[PDB]
Coordinates of C-alpha atoms (C1' of nucleotides) and ligand atoms in Angstrom, one line a residue:
Chain D
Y1 CA 0.0 0.0 0.0
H2 CA 2.8 2.4 0.9
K3 CA 4.5 1.6 -2.4
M4 CA 1.3 2.3 -4.3
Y5 CA 0.7 5.6 -2.4
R6 CA 4.2 6.9 -3.0
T7 CA 4.1 6.0 -6.7
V8 CA 0.8 7.7 -7.3
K9 CA 2.2 10.7 -5.4
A10 CA 5.3 10.7 -7.6
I11 CA 3.3 10.4 -10.8
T12 CA 0.4 12.7 -10.1
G13 CA 2.3 15.4 -8.3
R14 CA -0.7 16.3 -6.2
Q15 CA -1.6 13.8 -3.5
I16 CA -4.8 11.8 -3.7
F17 CA -4.2 8.8 -1.4
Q18 CA -3.1 8.8 2.2
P19 CA -0.1 7.6 4.2
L20 CA -0.4 5.3 7.2
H21 CA -0.6 7.8 10.0
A22 CA -4.1 9.1 9.3
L23 CA -5.1 5.6 8.4
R24 CA -4.2 4.2 11.8
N25 CA -5.7 7.3 13.4
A26 CA -9.1 6.7 11.7
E27 CA -8.6 3.0 12.4
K28 CA -8.4 3.6 16.2
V29 CA -11.3 5.9 15.9
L30 CA -13.4 3.1 14.3
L31 CA -12.0 0.5 16.6
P32 CA -13.8 -0.3 19.8
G33 CA -12.6 1.1 23.1
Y34 CA -12.5 4.8 22.0
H35 CA -15.7 6.5 22.6
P36 CA -17.3 7.5 25.9
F37 CA -20.6 6.2 27.2
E38 CA -22.3 5.4 30.5
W39 CA -24.6 3.0 32.3
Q40 CA -27.4 4.0 34.6
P41 CA -27.0 0.9 36.7
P42 CA -23.4 0.7 38.0
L43 CA -22.7 -2.8 36.4
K44 CA -21.3 -4.9 39.2
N45 CA -18.1 -6.9 38.5
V46 CA -17.4 -4.7 35.4
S47 CA -14.5 -2.2 35.1
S48 CA -15.1 1.5 34.7
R49 CA -12.6 2.3 31.9
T50 CA -14.1 3.2 28.6
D51 CA -10.7 3.0 26.9
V52 CA -9.7 -0.7 26.8
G53 CA -10.1 -2.8 23.6
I54 CA -8.1 -5.9 22.8
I55 CA -7.2 -8.0 25.9
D56 CA -6.2 -11.5 26.6
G57 CA -9.1 -14.0 26.5
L58 CA -7.4 -15.8 29.4
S59 CA -8.8 -13.3 32.0
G60 CA -5.8 -13.9 34.1
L61 CA -5.4 -17.6 33.8
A62 CA -2.1 -18.3 35.5
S63 CA -0.4 -20.8 33.2
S64 CA 2.5 -21.6 35.5
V65 CA 3.8 -25.2 35.4
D66 CA 2.5 -25.9 38.9
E67 CA -1.2 -25.6 37.7
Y68 CA -3.3 -27.1 35.0
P69 CA -1.4 -26.6 31.8
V70 CA -2.9 -25.2 28.6
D71 CA -1.6 -23.6 25.5
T72 CA -4.7 -22.1 23.8
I73 CA -4.1 -18.5 22.8
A74 CA -7.3 -16.4 23.3
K75 CA -7.8 -12.8 22.4
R76 CA -11.0 -10.9 23.2
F77 CA -12.7 -7.6 23.4
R78 CA -14.9 -6.3 26.1
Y79 CA -18.6 -6.9 25.3
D80 CA -20.0 -3.5 26.0
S81 CA -17.2 -1.9 23.9
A82 CA -18.3 -4.0 21.0
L83 CA -21.9 -3.1 21.5
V84 CA -21.2 0.6 21.6
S85 CA -18.9 0.5 18.6
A86 CA -21.4 -1.4 16.6
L87 CA -24.1 1.1 17.6
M88 CA -21.9 4.1 16.7
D89 CA -21.1 2.8 13.2
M90 CA -24.8 1.8 12.7
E91 CA -25.7 5.3 13.9
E92 CA -26.0 6.6 10.4
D93 CA -28.3 3.7 9.4
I94 CA -30.6 4.3 12.4
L95 CA -30.5 8.0 11.7
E96 CA -31.7 7.4 8.2
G97 CA -34.3 4.9 9.4
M98 CA -35.6 7.5 11.9
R99 CA -35.7 10.1 9.2
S100 CA -37.5 7.6 7.0
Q101 CA -40.2 6.4 9.3
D102 CA -41.8 9.8 10.1
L103 CA -39.9 11.0 13.2
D104 CA -37.3 13.5 14.2
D105 CA -33.7 13.3 15.2
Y106 CA -34.2 14.7 18.7
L107 CA -35.8 11.6 20.2
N108 CA -34.7 9.8 23.3
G109 CA -34.8 6.0 23.9
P110 CA -35.1 3.5 25.2
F111 CA -34.1 1.7 22.0
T112 CA -34.7 -2.0 22.3
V113 CA -32.0 -4.1 20.5
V114 CA -32.3 -7.8 19.6
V115 CA -28.9 -9.5 19.6
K116 CA -28.2 -13.2 18.7
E117 CA -25.0 -15.0 19.4
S118 CA -22.9 -17.7 17.9
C119 CA -19.6 -19.6 18.0
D120 CA -18.3 -22.4 15.8
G121 CA -15.0 -24.1 15.3
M122 CA -13.5 -24.0 11.9
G123 CA -11.3 -27.2 11.8
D124 CA -7.7 -26.8 10.7
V125 CA -6.4 -23.3 10.2
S126 CA -2.8 -24.4 9.7
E127 CA -0.3 -24.4 6.7
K128 CA 2.4 -26.7 7.9
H129 CA 5.3 -27.1 5.4
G130 CA 8.4 -28.0 7.4
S131 CA 7.6 -31.8 7.4
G132 CA 3.9 -32.1 6.4
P133 CA 1.1 -33.0 8.8
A134 CA 2.1 -31.8 12.2
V135 CA -1.2 -31.1 14.1
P136 CA -4.8 -30.6 13.2
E137 CA -4.9 -27.3 15.0
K138 CA -8.6 -26.4 15.6
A139 CA -9.6 -22.8 16.3
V140 CA -12.9 -21.2 17.1
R141 CA -14.3 -17.7 16.9
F142 CA -17.1 -16.4 19.2
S143 CA -19.2 -13.6 17.8
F144 CA -22.4 -11.7 18.2
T145 CA -24.8 -10.2 15.6
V146 CA -27.4 -7.5 15.8
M147 CA -30.5 -8.1 13.8
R148 CA -33.2 -5.7 15.0
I149 CA -33.4 -2.2 16.5
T150 CA -36.8 -0.8 17.6
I151 CA -38.2 2.1 19.6
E152 CA -41.6 2.2 21.3
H153 CA -43.1 5.7 21.5
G154 CA -46.6 6.6 22.6
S155 CA -48.6 3.4 22.1
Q156 CA -46.8 1.2 19.6
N157 CA -43.3 0.5 18.5
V158 CA -41.5 0.7 15.2
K159 CA -38.7 -1.3 13.5
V160 CA -36.3 1.5 12.9
Chain P
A1 CA -35.5 -36.8 1.8
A2 CA -33.7 -39.8 3.4
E3 CA -37.1 -41.2 4.3
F4 CA -38.4 -40.6 0.8
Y5 CA -35.4 -42.3 -0.8
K6 CA -35.8 -45.1 1.6
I7 CA -39.5 -45.6 1.0
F8 CA -38.8 -45.6 -2.8
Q9 CA -36.2 -48.3 -2.2
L10 CA -38.8 -50.2 -0.1
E11 CA -41.6 -49.7 -2.6
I12 CA -39.3 -51.0 -5.4
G13 CA -38.9 -53.6 -2.8
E14 CA -42.7 -54.0 -2.8
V15 CA -42.1 -55.2 0.7
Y16 CA -45.7 -55.1 1.7
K17 CA -45.7 -58.5 -0.1
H18 CA -42.1 -59.5 0.9
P19 CA -42.1 -59.2 4.7
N20 CA -38.5 -60.5 5.1
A21 CA -35.6 -59.1 3.1
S22 CA -31.9 -59.8 2.8
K23 CA -29.2 -57.1 2.2
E24 CA -28.7 -58.5 -1.3
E25 CA -32.3 -57.8 -2.2
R26 CA -32.1 -54.2 -1.0
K27 CA -28.7 -53.8 -2.7
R28 CA -30.2 -55.0 -6.0
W29 CA -33.2 -52.8 -5.5
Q30 CA -30.9 -49.8 -5.1
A31 CA -29.0 -51.0 -8.1
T32 CA -32.2 -51.1 -10.2
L33 CA -33.1 -47.7 -8.8
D34 CA -29.9 -46.0 -9.8
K35 CA -30.1 -47.8 -13.2
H36 CA -33.6 -46.6 -13.9
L37 CA -32.9 -43.1 -12.6
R38 CA -29.7 -42.8 -14.7
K39 CA -31.8 -44.0 -17.6
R40 CA -34.7 -41.7 -17.0
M41 CA -33.5 -38.6 -15.2
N42 CA -29.8 -39.3 -16.2
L43 CA -28.4 -37.9 -12.9
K44 CA -25.5 -39.0 -10.9
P45 CA -26.9 -41.3 -8.1
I46 CA -24.7 -41.4 -5.0
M47 CA -25.2 -42.5 -1.4
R48 CA -23.4 -39.3 -0.2
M49 CA -26.6 -37.4 0.5
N50 CA -26.5 -33.7 0.0
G51 CA -29.1 -30.9 -0.3
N52 CA -28.9 -30.4 -4.0
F53 CA -29.7 -34.0 -4.9
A54 CA -32.4 -34.0 -2.2
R55 CA -34.0 -30.9 -3.8
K56 CA -33.5 -32.6 -7.2
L57 CA -35.5 -35.6 -6.0
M58 CA -38.4 -33.5 -4.9
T59 CA -40.7 -33.1 -7.9
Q60 CA -43.7 -34.7 -9.5
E61 CA -41.6 -35.9 -12.4
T62 CA -39.4 -37.9 -10.0
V63 CA -42.3 -39.4 -8.1
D64 CA -43.9 -40.3 -11.5
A65 CA -40.8 -41.8 -13.1
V66 CA -40.2 -43.9 -10.0
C67 CA -43.8 -44.9 -9.2
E68 CA -44.3 -46.2 -12.8
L69 CA -41.9 -49.1 -12.1
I70 CA -44.0 -51.2 -9.7
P71 CA -47.4 -52.6 -10.4
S72 CA -49.1 -50.1 -8.1
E73 CA -52.8 -50.8 -7.8
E74 CA -52.8 -48.1 -5.1
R75 CA -49.3 -46.8 -4.3
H76 CA -49.3 -44.3 -7.2
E77 CA -51.8 -41.9 -5.6
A78 CA -50.5 -42.6 -2.1
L79 CA -47.1 -41.3 -3.2
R80 CA -48.8 -38.5 -5.1
Chain I
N1 CA -19.6 -23.3 6.2
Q2 CA -16.0 -23.1 5.2
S3 CA -16.6 -19.3 4.7
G4 CA -15.0 -18.2 8.0
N5 CA -12.2 -20.7 7.6
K6 CA -10.9 -19.6 4.2
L7 CA -11.2 -16.0 5.4
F8 CA -9.4 -16.7 8.6
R9 CA -6.5 -18.5 6.9
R10 CA -6.3 -15.7 4.3
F11 CA -6.0 -13.1 7.0
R12 CA -3.3 -15.2 8.7
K13 CA -1.4 -15.5 5.4
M14 CA -1.6 -12.0 3.9
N15 CA -1.4 -9.5 6.8
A16 CA 0.0 -10.9 10.0
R17 CA 3.0 -10.9 12.3
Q18 CA 5.1 -13.6 14.0
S19 CA 5.8 -14.8 17.6
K20 CA 2.0 -15.8 17.9
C21 CA 1.2 -12.9 20.4
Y22 CA 0.5 -10.0 18.1
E23 CA -0.8 -12.5 15.5
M24 CA -4.3 -13.1 17.0
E25 CA -4.7 -9.5 17.9
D26 CA -4.0 -8.5 14.3
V27 CA -6.4 -11.1 12.9
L28 CA -9.1 -10.0 15.4
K29 CA -8.5 -6.4 14.3
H30 CA -8.7 -7.1 10.6
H31 CA -11.6 -9.5 11.0
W32 CA -13.4 -6.9 12.9
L33 CA -12.7 -4.2 10.4
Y34 CA -13.9 -6.3 7.5
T35 CA -17.4 -6.5 8.9
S36 CA -18.3 -2.9 9.8
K37 CA -21.2 -1.2 8.1
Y38 CA -19.4 2.1 7.5
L39 CA -16.7 0.7 5.2
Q40 CA -19.2 -1.7 3.7
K41 CA -21.2 1.3 2.7
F42 CA -18.1 2.9 1.2
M43 CA -17.4 -0.3 -0.7
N44 CA -20.7 -0.9 -2.3
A45 CA -21.0 2.8 -3.4
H46 CA -21.0 1.8 -7.1
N47 CA -24.6 0.7 -7.8
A48 CA -26.4 3.6 -6.2
Chain R
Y1 CA -8.1 -4.4 -9.2
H2 CA -11.5 -4.2 -10.8
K3 CA -13.0 -3.6 -7.3
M4 CA -10.5 -0.8 -6.6
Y5 CA -11.1 0.8 -10.0
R6 CA -14.9 0.8 -9.7
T7 CA -14.8 2.0 -6.1
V8 CA -12.5 5.0 -6.8
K9 CA -14.4 5.7 -10.0
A10 CA -17.6 5.8 -8.0
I11 CA -16.3 7.8 -5.1
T12 CA -14.5 10.6 -7.1
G13 CA -16.8 10.7 -10.1
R14 CA -13.7 11.0 -12.2
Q15 CA -12.1 7.9 -13.8
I16 CA -8.6 8.1 -12.4
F17 CA -7.6 4.5 -13.1
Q18 CA -8.2 2.4 -16.2
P19 CA -10.5 -0.5 -16.9
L20 CA -9.3 -4.0 -17.7
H21 CA -9.4 -4.2 -21.5
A22 CA -7.1 -1.1 -21.7
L23 CA -4.8 -3.0 -19.3
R24 CA -4.9 -6.0 -21.7
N25 CA -3.9 -3.8 -24.6
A26 CA -1.2 -2.1 -22.6
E27 CA 0.2 -5.5 -21.8
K28 CA -0.1 -6.8 -25.4
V29 CA 2.1 -3.9 -26.5
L30 CA 4.8 -5.2 -24.2
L31 CA 4.8 -8.9 -24.8
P32 CA 7.1 -10.7 -27.3
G33 CA 5.8 -10.8 -30.9
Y34 CA 4.3 -7.4 -31.5
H35 CA 6.6 -5.1 -33.4
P36 CA 7.8 -5.8 -36.9
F37 CA 11.4 -6.3 -37.9
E38 CA 13.5 -8.2 -40.3
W39 CA 16.9 -9.8 -40.8
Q40 CA 19.4 -9.1 -43.5
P41 CA 20.4 -12.8 -43.7
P42 CA 17.2 -14.8 -44.0
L43 CA 17.9 -16.9 -40.8
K44 CA 17.9 -20.5 -41.8
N45 CA 15.7 -23.0 -40.0
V46 CA 13.7 -20.1 -38.4
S47 CA 10.1 -19.5 -39.2
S48 CA 9.9 -15.8 -40.2
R49 CA 6.4 -15.4 -39.0
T50 CA 6.6 -12.4 -36.8
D51 CA 3.7 -12.5 -34.3
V52 CA 4.4 -15.5 -32.1
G53 CA 4.2 -15.3 -28.4
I54 CA 4.3 -17.9 -25.7
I55 CA 4.9 -21.1 -27.5
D56 CA 5.1 -24.7 -26.2
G57 CA 8.6 -25.4 -24.8
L58 CA 8.7 -29.0 -26.1
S59 CA 8.9 -27.7 -29.8
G60 CA 6.4 -30.4 -30.7
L61 CA 7.7 -33.4 -28.8
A62 CA 6.4 -37.0 -29.0
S63 CA 4.1 -37.4 -26.0
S64 CA 2.4 -40.6 -27.4
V65 CA 2.4 -43.8 -25.4
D66 CA 4.6 -45.8 -27.7
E67 CA 7.4 -43.2 -27.3
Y68 CA 9.8 -42.5 -24.4
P69 CA 7.7 -41.0 -21.7
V70 CA 8.2 -37.5 -20.6
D71 CA 5.8 -35.7 -18.1
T72 CA 7.4 -32.2 -17.8
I73 CA 5.7 -29.0 -18.6
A74 CA 7.8 -26.4 -20.5
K75 CA 6.8 -23.0 -21.9
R76 CA 9.1 -20.9 -23.9
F77 CA 9.5 -17.8 -26.0
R78 CA 11.1 -17.7 -29.4
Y79 CA 14.6 -16.2 -29.0
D80 CA 14.5 -13.5 -31.7
Chain X
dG1 C1' 43.9 -71.3 -2.7
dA2 C1' 39.9 -68.9 -0.7
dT3 C1' 37.4 -65.7 3.1
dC4 C1' 38.5 -61.5 6.4
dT5 C1' 39.4 -56.5 6.8
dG6 C1' 41.1 -51.4 6.5
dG7 C1' 40.6 -48.0 2.9
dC8 C1' 38.5 -45.1 -0.3
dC9 C1' 34.2 -43.6 -3.1
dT10 C1' 30.2 -42.0 -3.5
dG11 C1' 24.8 -41.0 -3.2
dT12 C1' 22.5 -40.2 1.1
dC13 C1' 19.6 -37.5 4.8
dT14 C1' 20.5 -33.6 8.3
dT15 C1' 20.9 -29.3 9.7
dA16 C1' 22.0 -24.5 10.5
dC17 C1' 21.6 -19.1 9.2
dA18 C1' 20.6 -15.2 6.8
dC19 C1' 17.3 -12.8 5.2
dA20 C1' 12.2 -11.6 4.0
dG21 C1' 8.6 -10.6 5.3
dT22 C1' 5.1 -8.9 8.8
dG23 C1' 3.4 -5.2 11.6
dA24 C1' 4.5 -1.1 15.0
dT25 C1' 7.8 3.0 17.0
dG26 C1' 10.3 7.3 16.9
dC27 C1' 12.3 11.2 15.7
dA28 C1' 14.0 14.9 12.1
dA29 C1' 12.4 17.5 8.4
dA30 C1' 9.1 19.8 5.8
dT31 C1' 4.9 22.2 5.8
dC32 C1' 1.1 24.7 7.4
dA33 C1' -2.0 27.8 11.0
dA34 C1' -3.6 32.8 10.9
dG35 C1' -1.6 37.9 10.8
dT36 C1' -1.6 42.2 7.6
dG37 C1' 0.5 44.8 3.3
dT38 C1' 2.6 45.9 -0.4
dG39 C1' 3.5 44.8 -4.6
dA40 C1' 5.5 42.4 -8.2
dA41 C1' 3.5 39.7 -11.9
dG42 C1' -0.6 38.5 -15.1
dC43 C1' -4.8 39.8 -18.2
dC44 C1' -8.2 43.6 -21.0
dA45 C1' -11.1 48.5 -23.3
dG46 C1' -9.2 52.1 -26.5
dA47 C1' -7.3 52.3 -31.5
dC48 C1' -2.8 52.1 -34.0
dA49 C1' 1.8 49.9 -37.0
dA50 C1' 6.0 46.1 -37.7
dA51 C1' 8.6 40.6 -39.1
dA52 C1' 8.0 36.2 -41.8
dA53 C1' 6.2 33.4 -45.8
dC54 C1' 3.9 31.6 -50.3
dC55 C1' 1.6 32.9 -54.8
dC56 C1' 1.1 35.5 -59.6
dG57 C1' 2.3 38.6 -63.2
Chain G
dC1 C1' -60.6 25.2 -8.7
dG2 C1' -59.6 25.2 -14.1
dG3 C1' -57.4 26.5 -18.9
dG4 C1' -53.3 29.5 -21.5
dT5 C1' -48.9 29.9 -21.9
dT6 C1' -44.4 28.7 -20.6
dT7 C1' -40.4 25.2 -18.9
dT8 C1' -38.6 20.6 -19.7
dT9 C1' -38.0 15.1 -21.3
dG10 C1' -39.6 10.4 -24.2
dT11 C1' -40.0 8.0 -28.5
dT12 C1' -38.0 4.5 -32.1
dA13 C1' -35.0 3.8 -35.8
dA14 C1' -29.8 2.5 -37.4
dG15 C1' -24.7 1.0 -36.6
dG16 C1' -21.1 1.7 -34.5
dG17 C1' -17.7 1.8 -30.2
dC18 C1' -17.4 1.3 -25.2
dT19 C1' -17.9 -0.8 -20.5
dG20 C1' -19.6 -3.8 -16.7
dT21 C1' -20.6 -7.8 -15.2
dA22 C1' -21.9 -13.0 -16.3
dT23 C1' -19.7 -17.1 -17.7
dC24 C1' -16.2 -20.8 -18.6
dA25 C1' -13.2 -24.4 -18.2
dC26 C1' -10.8 -25.5 -15.0
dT27 C1' -8.3 -27.3 -10.9
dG28 C1' -7.8 -27.4 -5.5
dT29 C1' -9.9 -28.4 -0.9
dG30 C1' -12.4 -29.2 3.7
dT31 C1' -15.7 -31.3 6.4
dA32 C1' -20.3 -35.2 6.9
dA33 C1' -21.7 -39.9 5.7
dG34 C1' -21.6 -43.5 7.2
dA35 C1' -18.6 -47.8 7.1
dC36 C1' -16.2 -50.3 9.9
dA37 C1' -13.0 -52.1 13.9
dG38 C1' -13.1 -53.3 18.0
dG39 C1' -15.3 -53.7 23.1
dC40 C1' -18.3 -55.5 26.0
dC41 C1' -21.8 -58.2 27.4
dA42 C1' -26.5 -62.5 27.9
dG43 C1' -27.2 -66.7 26.4
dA44 C1' -25.8 -71.4 23.9
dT45 C1' -22.6 -75.1 24.9
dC46 C1' -18.8 -78.6 26.7
Chain O
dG1 C1' -19.5 -75.3 36.8
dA2 C1' -16.5 -71.8 32.3
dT3 C1' -16.1 -70.4 27.3
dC4 C1' -17.4 -69.0 22.7
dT5 C1' -20.8 -66.1 20.2
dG6 C1' -24.4 -62.7 18.1
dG7 C1' -25.6 -58.5 18.8
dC8 C1' -25.4 -53.9 20.2
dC9 C1' -22.9 -49.7 21.0
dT10 C1' -19.4 -46.7 19.7
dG11 C1' -15.1 -44.0 18.4
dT12 C1' -12.3 -43.5 14.7
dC13 C1' -11.1 -43.0 9.1
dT14 C1' -11.8 -42.5 4.7
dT15 C1' -14.1 -40.0 0.9
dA16 C1' -17.4 -37.6 -2.6
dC17 C1' -18.9 -33.2 -3.4
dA18 C1' -20.1 -28.6 -3.0
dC19 C1' -17.9 -24.5 -3.6
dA20 C1' -13.5 -20.8 -4.2
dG21 C1' -10.5 -18.4 -7.2
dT22 C1' -8.6 -17.2 -11.8
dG23 C1' -7.4 -15.1 -16.6
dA24 C1' -9.8 -15.0 -20.5
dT25 C1' -14.2 -14.8 -23.2
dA26 C1' -19.1 -13.2 -24.4
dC27 C1' -22.6 -10.6 -24.4
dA28 C1' -26.0 -6.8 -22.4
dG29 C1' -26.8 -2.7 -22.3
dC30 C1' -25.4 2.7 -23.1
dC31 C1' -23.9 7.7 -26.2
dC32 C1' -25.0 9.6 -31.1
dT33 C1' -28.7 12.1 -35.0
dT34 C1' -34.0 13.9 -37.1
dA35 C1' -37.8 14.6 -35.7
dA36 C1' -42.3 15.4 -35.1
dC37 C1' -45.2 14.6 -32.1
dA38 C1' -46.1 12.5 -27.3
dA39 C1' -45.9 13.6 -22.3
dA40 C1' -44.5 16.0 -17.1
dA41 C1' -44.1 20.4 -14.5
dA42 C1' -44.6 26.2 -13.0
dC43 C1' -46.9 30.4 -13.0
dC44 C1' -50.5 33.3 -14.0
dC45 C1' -54.9 34.7 -15.8
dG46 C1' -59.4 33.7 -15.2
Chain V
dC1 C1' 12.2 37.8 -59.3
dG2 C1' 9.6 41.8 -57.4
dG3 C1' 5.2 43.0 -55.2
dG4 C1' 0.4 41.1 -53.5
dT5 C1' -2.1 38.9 -49.6
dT6 C1' -2.2 36.7 -45.1
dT7 C1' -0.4 35.6 -40.7
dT8 C1' 1.2 37.0 -36.7
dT9 C1' 3.2 40.5 -33.5
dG10 C1' 3.2 43.9 -31.1
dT11 C1' 2.0 48.6 -29.1
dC12 C1' 1.2 52.9 -24.8
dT13 C1' -2.6 54.4 -21.6
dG14 C1' -5.3 53.4 -18.4
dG15 C1' -7.5 49.8 -15.6
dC16 C1' -8.8 45.2 -13.4
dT17 C1' -7.2 40.6 -11.0
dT18 C1' -3.8 37.8 -8.2
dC19 C1' -0.8 35.2 -5.6
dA20 C1' 4.5 36.1 -3.5
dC21 C1' 7.3 37.3 0.1
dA22 C1' 7.9 38.8 4.6
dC23 C1' 8.6 37.1 8.8
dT24 C1' 6.6 34.7 13.1
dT25 C1' 6.9 30.7 15.7
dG26 C1' 4.7 26.9 17.2
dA27 C1' 1.5 22.7 15.9
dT28 C1' 1.0 19.0 12.6
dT29 C1' 2.0 15.6 9.5
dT30 C1' 5.2 13.5 6.7
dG31 C1' 9.5 10.1 5.5
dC32 C1' 12.3 7.2 6.4
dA33 C1' 15.1 4.6 9.6
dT34 C1' 14.8 1.3 13.2
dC35 C1' 12.7 -2.6 15.8
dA36 C1' 10.9 -7.7 17.3
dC37 C1' 10.5 -11.7 15.7
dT38 C1' 10.0 -16.3 13.4
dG39 C1' 10.0 -19.4 8.3
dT40 C1' 12.3 -21.6 5.1
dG41 C1' 15.3 -23.5 2.0
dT42 C1' 19.0 -23.9 1.0
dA43 C1' 24.6 -25.9 0.6
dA44 C1' 28.0 -27.9 3.9
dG45 C1' 28.6 -32.0 5.8
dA46 C1' 29.2 -36.1 7.9
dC47 C1' 28.4 -41.2 6.7
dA48 C1' 27.6 -45.6 5.8
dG49 C1' 27.0 -49.2 2.1
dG50 C1' 29.8 -51.0 -1.1
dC51 C1' 33.4 -52.5 -3.5
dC52 C1' 38.0 -53.0 -3.7
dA53 C1' 43.0 -55.1 -3.0
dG54 C1' 45.9 -56.6 1.0
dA55 C1' 46.3 -60.2 4.4
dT56 C1' 46.0 -64.8 6.2
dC57 C1' 45.0 -70.2 7.8
Ligands
CA201 CA1 -18.9 -26.9 12.2

DNA sequence: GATCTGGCCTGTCTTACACAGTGATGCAAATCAAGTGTGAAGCCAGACAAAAACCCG
DNA sequence: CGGGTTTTTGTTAAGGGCTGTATCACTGTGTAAGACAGGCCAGATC
DNA sequence: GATCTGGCCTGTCTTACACAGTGATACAGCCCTTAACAAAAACCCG
DNA sequence: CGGGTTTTTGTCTGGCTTCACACTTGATTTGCATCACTGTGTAAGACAGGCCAGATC
């Protein structure tokens, strides 16, 4: 990408594309763990930082040799961070839906969101070429999915 | 779909008259089934059951071209 | 189906680090960024 | 590349890149076998046809069964 | 006269090491915020007179 | 609430060049079927 | 009395088969000119 | 081969735009060098069968 960017800059004279600085800047803007938010309940057993994204999935599993041994690398988000980031980049969609279904922008909630969840293993994910078949290393992603956002105002509700 | 393919193999078995049955009889019945289906529908019959072949078996043309094999005094409209 | 698996192996093979510590963080980052509505709207901006 | 071309063409409105057929013509101008030329000696045992590109490397070998077997795959250019 | 044995000869796995990639840091350098304020270029309205070239009597 | 006049596009030719996807002959490639190899019993049998 | 056996579970182990990806190929539609009528609207008079 | 007929090519006189420095000096962003760290395929590099002639009961 950097090669492509510098070549088009050298040829065109004026700059059209971007270098990696603003790319990573807009990336960490779009990444979870960046925007502030709050909870009206205090959310027992949950941290108060709004600025933590990628963490170990191990949650402090001590993997010293004196204990039960594992090797499974696990990376994870915080759940509420993923929810608020998914909301903030579907914000334009729900804004357009609110402008479409005969309402205003200055509405309050409470917006009711329907979220399904899923995880499935994928079998082997490995490309072993040193000697051939080493291990059928099996990996698994765990994921969520929004599918419905509604608001009830007055009497009824509306699928916005 | 598995039950439909099975009941077609057992109707080409005509096993409401043959109460006992060996594995050779059912194997030959499946053999006649794949022979007639590769002669009529000209598909690729296989025991590796998938969704495309299952959807392929679900039509009136299939139920007709299989039900016409046996001397069905009744089984035609039952399958229909 | 195999859909996640081919995607996950492609993300491990194209854009990833070594030492197996930054590797999963990078594939989680890229696999997250692939499925956001904002860039998806930027990417299907041809037919409208 | 087609995806990148159509996305930037949509988002700017101007067509800054090129489509694929122009790319194929721009690569056909750079392959072997496009420009004309000749040789002041007539180059014995050389076919003077002047628009050959990637030819088979085996120069017409004898891959039949009754011959010495060879299973290699060779692709070549003509030298001139 | 006929087996036993060190000596070479040669086709074998076997095994390390340097680099090629991957991202992410980290400074040094260039460039840009605005601030006036001249102030040098560039183009047009008015109508009026030279250089350079190809054709015909 | 309705015409007169004014302010803007469609319509089918024809024969092109241009472009944007759909297809095409292909391999490679993983995950379900379901087949089978044992493993372990309740009853025939010495 | 103890031992083989048919049958019933059950944990692997191969495989077809549905797709994935690719450069090249094949169309499916889209500007261009008379042109004389065909429409939509906006405003204003009535 | 001299003159006709274009084709450019200028001209002050006044009258418009239009960025260029000129510093200023302190954020900003840009470019390239550096960093951490395994993957891989290779060319040395033993190495042992194998086949000798030398040796010997
Ligand atoms: Ca699965």
